[PDB]
Design a protein around this ligand. Structure first.
Ligand code: ZFY
Ligand code: GLN
Ligand code: GLN
Ligand code: MG
Ligand code: MG
Ligand code: MG
Ligand code: MG
Lengths: 497, 497, 497, 497
């Protein structure tokens, strides 16, 4: 296969995953079948071990893998369905080698990091690159590998050593390395400094990989004198020093890379047989004037992106105002902030988790303000109506054609969406609710779990057990989120017509 | 506790384990309770995964741990009984952290090498240092930690980072580092080169540990000009540059270290409240003239050491001539080497394993030459008499007082020795042999396994199921090995009188 | 002596020289005699080799040394008079060792970087620290050594190796290291990243120096979670992690360091027997409302600082608008910018160099707007009146008591100021001017060079051959600059009364 | 041009200069014009600064350059005449850049190691490679550059950075790197260790150069398992792992390299349009039985080599027994060693320097034992007969045809040989000697200095002012040395016939 490693320098928050995902959609626009692998040098096996504050949200894959939000960036940019083994971690590879050792698979030889851990990385990358990750069963052409962390962190040392070897245990026609690095810009002088990028490239080149492209991330576009220092000290041509400055949106990052001519580089280097929409979406995003103010009651990064996809599609600006449920709760300055936000809420969003959510539900229910409840927001909705693990892709069957979500999903009798919940509605008690305004509208194939609710005597009050955020992509807004913004702007009855 | 790290430079075969074990017996001669821990940066969990060619023999511990022969060096020098967790490996620590992660013991935080793997090393070292490893239940005073590998190998990087932190997460009064390094001596010029030791100390000091002692291993004693270069370039006083040259025996290495005044250094540095036998044994070893030629039919390092302990005790030189059983086998130049060695064999030794052993057994049996069979050498002896896992410490009961091994072990009704076998003698068939010359003399407490055989109509033909090698120490020769050399020299009937 | 090394991490523009100069004035406020040495790892011998665009202005010392502007920061903060050998460079030290080699001073031994270049650094630092650099002939107590560059640049490697050795070839009571490092703050998230500081401290600690204080430079004050990561990963206590954020002025940086308690650290560590004005000047600077707009017709950093000292003393804000003389020149958008700036010029400043300066002189002369000409601005003033190396400290004698500059300098018959010029006024032609409005008012002791001019029929049009900028300090504004701001605000005749 | 860098790993005494010189004579046997440059990272400018104990003898070049003996190895192997600038040193390059800086040749830019010192290395290497260093005025085809020191020493860091850049600022067709490294062989086990070579290649590859050949120096030929570890861990094919073991002679080292097929590698890699004598000389050397015992009364490495060239040519073994003149002196165990050696002296050799030499002269003179005096040995000979700087190539004119040295040099009226002396014979006093047995036979063209003496009433007692050692090569023995061995074996009168 053809392989593109993306390494990071100086600091991890430079957006390497957006760059890597951007080059993947560039290559896809050039007609290529692109895979992605993310290396996360953490010793954790799956992101289910994390808090939402640590690594952002737990993105959920079709196979039930729990991963950090950057596999959602590859899914959203490439329109791809990743498997749990497209995330490589140090825990996953060390445990693999330890298990092989105990099985005698290393034939009584001493197991050690080089070669055995480095071979495990190569074995895994070669095979997961070949996985059909598009819906097309045809073997991929390119694999973009993001090496997470910063080159020079101790946890990354097996992977760069593996990738050093992988140059030679392949061809230069088949492997290149992108180094993404911070070019810090000083306050008082405006001066862009190249020293961290030079030092990071020196470290990377000391690990036996050379930058084939250097991607500068900078606050402002870099000056030619700055690009000249980088091309001289990092021993790469000026045409191989790319600048991605702070832009308006992720839609503009692929467009910017065409305007740095990366396709000519990848054609020449990787010997490749080679956007519109990203321009259009960027150009639209920069012109969004009509505010839709929604109350959310990187912890919710797919939720925010799903709303922005929906907002863009209806040519509105999202104003996502985040409210803690403890602010709305009876426990008082932040109460008069939170409830004031909840007054100017055109829609209420109660996402998942593991108290004032119930008050926001009551507010939305009573005042007839548009509501989307996801996972816990469905369960709390059922609960508060009464007062007044299941992991990965599953089929949800609609119990009727008289469903607003069914119209938004395109009249289909069932949907396949991603789940992540341990708790569900009691099958014996459903007959308390069916008599009244809260219809249970979607169920599993087993008929035990109700998985969608709709409140009938309301513009749009829906609850879903699945996370339809993980299915959201710019080209196809997540229908439960689209319905929320359509309802909040009154356009729902025009769309459903 | 007080801690002594022993790091290695340039190459691992410099004898760091003998140096570390030597300083342990020095400190023990100074009256201190000494523990040992060995770090082996391999990803293997236990040495049962190894061939005998890889890491030498599998030493067996009382608890059934399978470890490399260097935990036998700490056992033999200190008269200590190590536990399986006095061996630290990368596999054992990474699996520990992975298991803690999956249990949620890191409270949703990202697990990473620093701190979490480095803390696991510190946690383990602090607690295993406190283990009563002598028979005395009193908590130890010093722990000698040998860091296996060479400082600068990638697998060693978590451990040196842990030990860097461990300086500061302790006191300088409680931690020091010994660096053992090759001083190569060139052929043509006789010139001793200090450059590898300087470069290795620069690497070690780049990992945030400084040599408190530098132990030069050299072929010849080092010149003062060589010691001056090391003390200048490695930034350590001349009194802290120790030379251990190629000596006669391991008995001389502690004695040499007194003659480099290390006790004064450890008294001053570690604030310690502070040999004869090692001199005596060294002085004896250098005067061994009477050859006992024994045929063995680092793969057998405890076997060789057990014979040398026995040889020294009877003031004989061992000539251990190693013969492959395939040389003795019918499959022919090496046949006339092997059988010629077997002709001048004063004793035959058939150690354990997993064909010409049977011929050597037949030879020894028929010609009435002294025989010791260990594990497989007992099983093949039973088999060839007929023609003509159980792991760690177990109690073997003697079935009679009429046992030669029972006299050698001191008339005791049972012995406790170390086992490592999956196969044993059939309890139904023992009644074929008891009628004849092959007595089954030792059994387990269960009475199912016969564990010792003695052939009655022979000077000394014994078979044992245990490995009594692992019990051998210079002060107390292993009785089955002592019996072999006593028999082979005719001194048996004088000893047993 | 007591020594404080100040090392830099990530990027050089973090202000290490202001931090180092700030701790020097802190220690001086604590009553200590402080020296400064600046190491510049460039191979250049003196800054006379530089353009003004490269390293900023060439600061001139009393002995005629040409140095970068950071020796002016030590002069301005400490009220000190540095010698040319308080600047150490790689060129100065390598040439020293090469010269010693050729003289046989190394006694036929091979000269090499360690030890001989590292010893040369130590020799130089020990002796220049002892230099009376105050006017007091008493030997100094502390020496602040700024190591220029970033730790990990190849040119800095001799100096950090020297300073590693210098810890041990001294006492910990007598040496400490401050590491100044960038904590980059990301745009989108507001997130302060500690990774470069951790990596830079790892590099510094790999060169055998540990941070005794870590000084974070950040745009905003750092959060406690950020300070905790630094104190954990850089293995230093929280009290040793200092934050200097972007402040109003250099006057506030010493004041901030008291509010980080550095005096307690230096008392404890360096065993020291231990501001008001800096608070007052900072507090004043933040309240400057009255604008004095001056046209200047880091290239002029002492000029700008001299104006700011003058501005602060008269409680005005300086608006220094910089105009290129080529903009004012007949060669046209920038002409209407430049001449528009020159219209709102309350004073014209024509500093030194090596064309529209003559037009600005004519403008100021004719319209009677306050003028200060320095070096070339005196020579061009003489020239344009007619139309209508001498290096370091020299004595200039006033030819009369009827001098405005003589009143501003305190009625004294001569002044001693710093010179840097190859050209001077023709002694035969002076009699053309003395007849008219342009008096030559200051001369050298030789009587050949006129060194000050004053135009009599004007509020304030003075020219000086010396650079009185280099003499400017916050406590004592440079009288030619003070006169300019006093004239420009009309306060001159109140001051001279 | 084509360039071959030769780097060293682990320790400098591995013989890199003999390897580099050997590949140069291989390429010369393939018909190529070969240059050599030696980089010595010492800060010394010329070896005239050294003692003879430090870097061995001072080799003298035709232009009067004073250099270490390794430029004599390139002269002897290639039959080449090196210039003083074929030795590059850190002193020579830093002084060059400092001088350029002071001249303004860097146009006011900050001079720093990268680029300016690294460019100076490249500039120098490119131009000195083009120097006609053979007598043929045609521009060379290959330049062998030995980088002295060990890769990873701090002084070598500018040169490896220059050579990293030089790969890219050339072509792979035009540059390759040979890494020479110690494979230490342990005493007790016979085990050859690859770890230092792996670590040294990791350091070298961290400086951005990869081994194109790895030359193992080992005591014994390396095993295939050892070559496999090196080829795996150093990421080079088995055919690129060369072993040079301890051999009989330098004559065998080129022959060994053909038997490792290096010409096939250099043909393929450097795109080259491509021994007998070295085999013959090696084969002869191994069969030398007839001892010629000569008393010498790396300090004298060209002297020893000149004797060995002479010995080989007359098919004798040299037994060069070295005697200190202080042993022969009246100041007594070593007296009876020294004079005993002087009794079995078939020839006396008194080489140059700066007391018992006079006694050895008297001994040789009186007993009529063959004598060669060089420089000081001529001056002391003149002196002791009476009792009983001029640097580089100079023309010496023979005063007569009646000269034994003139016959040995081939009847020529003058010779051109290399000089290094400050003292000479007094022109007024020569008329004391000419009357008697000591003829002055060679003079300079000036007629002031007598430069050769011959004692007439003796088999062979010659003194020369020049060092004819530096002219010695295996193909053409130095005639004054050849005469000594011919005289000492009685073959002189057969040769001179
Ligand atoms: C939330 C929003 C509106 C967005 O653009 N935010 C934003 C804005 C700017 C940048 C940015 C600025 N400069 C540089 C770089 C980098 F590239 F260098 F890092 N990034 C990053 N994220 C959005 C809608 S859809 C989406 N993401 S998404 O669903 O994956 C879809 C793309 C496939 N985000
Ligand atoms: N210092 C300056 O401004 C230099 C002025 C002028 N070029 C001279 O040499 O006198
Ligand atoms: N080269 C030498 O042997 C030197 C000889 C003597 N010291 C001189 O200067 O002439
Ligand atoms: Mg810069
Ligand atoms: Mg040396
Ligand atoms: Mg972080
Ligand atoms: Mg090995």
């Amino acid at each position: 296969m053809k392989y593109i490693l993306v390494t990071g320098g100086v600091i991890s928050g430079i957006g390497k995953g957006i760059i890597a995902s951007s080059i993947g959609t560039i290559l896809k626009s050039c007609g290529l079948r692109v895979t992605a692998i993310k290396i996360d040098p953490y010793i954790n096996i799956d992101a289910g071990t994390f808090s939402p504050y640590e690594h952002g949200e737990v993105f959920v894959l079709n196979d039930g893998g729990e991963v950090d939000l950057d596999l959602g960036n590859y899914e959203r940019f490439l329109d791809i369905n990743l498997y749990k083994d497209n995330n490589i971690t140090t825990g996953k590879i060390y445990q693999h080698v330890i298990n092989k050792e105990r099985r005698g698979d290393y034939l009584g030889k001493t197991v050690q990091v080089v070669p055995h851990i480095t071979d495990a990385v190569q074995e895994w990358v070669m095979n997961q690159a070949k996985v059909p990750v598009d819906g097309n069963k045809e073997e991929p052409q390119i694999c973009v590998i993001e090496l997470g962390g910063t080159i020079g962190d101790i946890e990354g040392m097996p992977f760069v050593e593996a990738f050093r070897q992988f140059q030679f245990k392949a061809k230069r026609e088949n492997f290149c390395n992108i180094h993404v690095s911070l070019v810090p810009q000083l306050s008082a002088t405006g001066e862009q400094k190249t020293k961290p990028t030079q030092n990071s490239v020196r470290a990377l080149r000391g690990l036996g990989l050379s930058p084939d492209l250097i991607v500068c991330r900078s606050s402002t576009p870099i000056e030619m004198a700055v690009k000249e220092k980088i091309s001289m000290f990092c021993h790469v041509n000026p045409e191989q020093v790319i600048c991605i400055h702070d832009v308006s949106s992720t839609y503009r990052v692929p467009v910017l890379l065409e305007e740095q001519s990366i396709v000519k580089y990848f054609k020449e280097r990787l010997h490749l047989p080679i956007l519109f929409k990203w321009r259009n979406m960027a150009d639209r995003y920069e012109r969004l004037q009509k505010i839709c103010s929604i109350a959310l009651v990187d912890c919710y990064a797919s939720v925010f992106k799903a709303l922005e996809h929906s907002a863009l599609a209806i040519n509105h600006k999202l104003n996502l105002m985040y409210i803690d449920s403890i602010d709305l709760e009876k426990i008082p300055v932040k109460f008069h902030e939170a409830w004031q936000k909840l007054c100017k809420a055109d829609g209420i969003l109660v996402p998942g988790g593991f108290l004032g959510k119930l008050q926001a539900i009551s507010w939305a229910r009573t005042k007839k303000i548009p509501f989307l409840g996801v996972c816990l927001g469905m369960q709390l909705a059922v609960i508060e109506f009464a007062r007044n693990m299941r992991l990965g892709i599953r089929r949800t069957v609609f119990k009727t054609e008289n469903s607003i979500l069914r119209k938004l999903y395109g009249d289909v009798p069932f949907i396949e969406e991603r789940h992540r919940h341990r708790f569900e509605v009691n099958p014996n008690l459903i007959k308390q609710f069916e008599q009244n305004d809260l219809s249970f509208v979607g169920q599993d194939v087993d008929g035990d779990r109700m998985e969608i609710i709709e409140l009938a005597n309301h513009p749009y009050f829906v609850g879903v057990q699945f996370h339809p955020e993980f299915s959201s992509r710019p080209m196809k807004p997540s229908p439960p989120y689209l319905g929320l913004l359509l309802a909040a702007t009154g356009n729902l009855n025009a769309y459903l017509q």
